[model samples]
Target: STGSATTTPIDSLDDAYITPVQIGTPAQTLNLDFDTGSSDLWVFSSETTASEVDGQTIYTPSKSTTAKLLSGATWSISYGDGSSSSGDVYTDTVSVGGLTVTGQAVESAKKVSSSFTEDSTIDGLLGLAFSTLNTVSPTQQKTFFDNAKASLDSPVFTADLGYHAPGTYNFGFIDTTAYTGSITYTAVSTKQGFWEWTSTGYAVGSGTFKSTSIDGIADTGTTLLYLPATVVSAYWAQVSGAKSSSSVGGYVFPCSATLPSFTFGVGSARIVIPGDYIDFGPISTGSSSCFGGIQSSAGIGINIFGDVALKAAFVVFNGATTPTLGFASK
Candidate 1:
């Protein structure tokens, strides 16, 4: 079977993208953030505190005849951005696009960090990474992708993210029309439970390419592209009035400053991120100084090709026994 769905950005800067999903027997619908970086399908639910709800959609397991509590099972997870959620588990029928999975583990949030509670754009998160990353105790649960891949015609899914518009996610088959030219395949090291891979090199604008291995994860859950300090410094150094500031966080420059496109190698393929993708927009409302989309990942301890980079190309998460990633320009 094949399935597809459209995902829309949350904020002006595309902080998060949400896709609609149906859960439980009665088909309760909610906009969920499909995260490839983590492996727990957690959601704001009836179990969450009233003060913690904050105008977001909440899953009510009690409403579904198909929902059954997974007694003694619990989940807790902390994200790279320092946000977290923890709760009890239930098994229910979950559907995305047209694909359905029975007895999918659904973590109902008992508590959530302020960052998540404040983001009304997403009702929950649907994890697409390997099940090895699941935080459930006693027995780990499989991700929505893991549970659905076996039934998919190709055991694969693809991400076509957009800069400021809505994007699409396809399961089972690649949409040939979604990309231009050919796709370049690369080995994925799921050893870290992420879609981890190495890039051949990078180039700043029209400058000479630097030949270096850049190890990173293709995380749709993350907002910006994070590179090594050297690469970030080189890109910002070329822009006038650019500086790294602790007060503003990361690199900031005049909103009027020209930003050069960022290019990165994916095997033999080169994906170019337009300057508009890097400008990131003003740090605060109506502020002149803008935050850079490309920032130093040294602080995070891992390079990340976040939404900023993903929107520049077509990404495939091949769910074969020997998993691999495919990149193509659009």
Candidate 2:
């Protein structure tokens, strides 16, 4: 049988997408952020201090007869934005869409940062990275996908992210109707626990395509695209009234300005990001200035093709043979 699932944006403009995942017997469902960057399936749970828990739905393992604690196993993760969480481990039956994995490691949060505690909507994170990156101590655990892959028709999944609309994520198979054009494939290096690849080059607006090979990751967890500072500067230079404001911490421009499209090369294919997508809304409430979605990677070192970049195309995270990334225009 084919296994699949549809992902819907949690907010307008597709800031992030959440999918329902059931943990333990009787199926206690929780909406989780399916992150390709990090490898850990953790939730805000009953173990979390009540004062620290705000609007998030807490997972209660005790309520499930099948839940089993993995004594001494613990996990802690931190995001680039300073958000973090740490917790003990429990093994449970976890299912996503039609896929199921028994004895999956489920981390229950005992502490969380303000970033997570304040966001009442997100309950947990579902890591889609390689199983080797899983954080369970004593024995690293496999992701839900990895554990269920043996039952899948193929070791593959498609991410059809959207803008201000709902998108679909299909597992075990690809739906031909969801994308347009030929799917361009490129090899990925999983050395760093990320789906890393080298782009052939990039072009800013109507400018010529610069042949500069860039190493970057297909990170679904990130909200915006991040490239080298020089690349970001070159793109924004074409925009009038665009300036790198310290107050804004990135390039900001007049809302009335007409921005150019940003294009990136993957193998022989060129995935173009429209100007409207780069203009990441306004900088602030009632403001006429806007923020550029493509920012400088700076200290991060690697470019991140986040939701903004990925949403412009249909992405395939294929684990079949040599890990590869396939992209096609939507």
Candidate 3:
């Protein structure tokens, strides 16, 4: 059987997308970030210290009749953006769309970084990555998808993120109507607990496609295209007034400047990111400068094709024995 979730961009930032899901026996509704780059199904909860939580809705496990505490198990996670959360574990019924998974590991946040505390709209994160990436301690935890895949009609899911618009995350099957053109498949390496793929080449605008192998992950949680430093610099060069701003920690360009499209190659398949998509948004309210969506993944070993890039394509995450990724124009 197929299932689905409605995903909406947060404000005009387009930095993250959130979807509603039910947790616990009585069905406590929560808005969660379906992150493919991570593997922890965590939520802000009553267990969190009062001071640690901001105005976020907290999930009280005690209120669910089917909730079972996983004593001695703990979880703490840190992101590339320095956001983090930590807490104990509980097993409960988690539902997405109309599909349900019983006894799914749910990490209840007892502590959260200021980044997570300030973003009250995000109640938790529903990880879709390989279970090997889970951060639970004492005992490893399984992701909701991993727990429910066996029962699903098909071990597949699709992410259709829109630009400053509503999207959909379809589970168990791919909706042929969601995308145009035949899908191009690529082998994924889950050794790093990510949907890692190597691009055959990449180019800025209509420029020459350099046959360079770029390895990166499909990350819905991240907002920008994080690539090698040299690649970021090369792209900024085409922008009239673009420069790497130490203050902002990324490249910024004139809001009125014309930008070139970014293209990435996967064998014979190529995905082109429109120039308008490269200009993330104004650096500040009413500012004439905008931040570039392409940045350097200097510290973070692998690159990330975040929302900025993914929104340009319809992505299929196949959970077959090979665990391949299929991309197509949306």
Top candidate when judged by lDDT against the true structure: 1
For model 2, give the RMSD to the true fold: 1.3
Tens-digit lDDT track of model 1 for 1-330: 888999999888888899999999799998999999999999999999878888888899999999999999999999998999999999999988998999999999999999988887789999988899999987899998898888899999999998899999999999999999999999999888999999999999999988899999999999999999999999999899999999988999999988999999998789999999997888889999999999999878899999999999999999999999999999
Where does model 3 exceed 4 Å of error? Answer: none
* Winner by lDDT between candidate 2 and candidate 1: 1
| lDDT agreement with native, every candidate | 0.93, 0.88, 0.91
Measured with C-alpha atoms, the lDDT of residue 6 in candidate 2 is 69
Model 2 has a clash total of: 0
lDDT per residue (tens digit) for residues 1-330 in model 2: 355666778776567888888988888888898998888999999999788899888889999999999999999888878899998999999888878888999999999999888877788999988888888887788887787777788888888888777777778888888889989999999999988999988999989999888899999889899999989999999999999898888899999999899999999899999988887778888899988888999988789999989999999999876899999998
RMSD in angstroms between candidate 1 and the native structure over all alpha carbons: 0.8
Candidate 2, run of 10 with poorest lDDT: 1-10
Local error of candidate 3 at residue 237 (angstroms): 1.3
TM-score, predicted candidate 3 vs. hidden true structure: 0.97
Q: Can you give the lDDT of residue 245 in candidate 1?
A: 97
Candidate 2: C-alpha lDDT: 0.88
- TM-score preference between candidates 2 and 3, better one: 3
320 Cα displacement, candidate 2 (Å): 2.0
Candidate 3 local accuracy as lDDT? Answer: 0.91
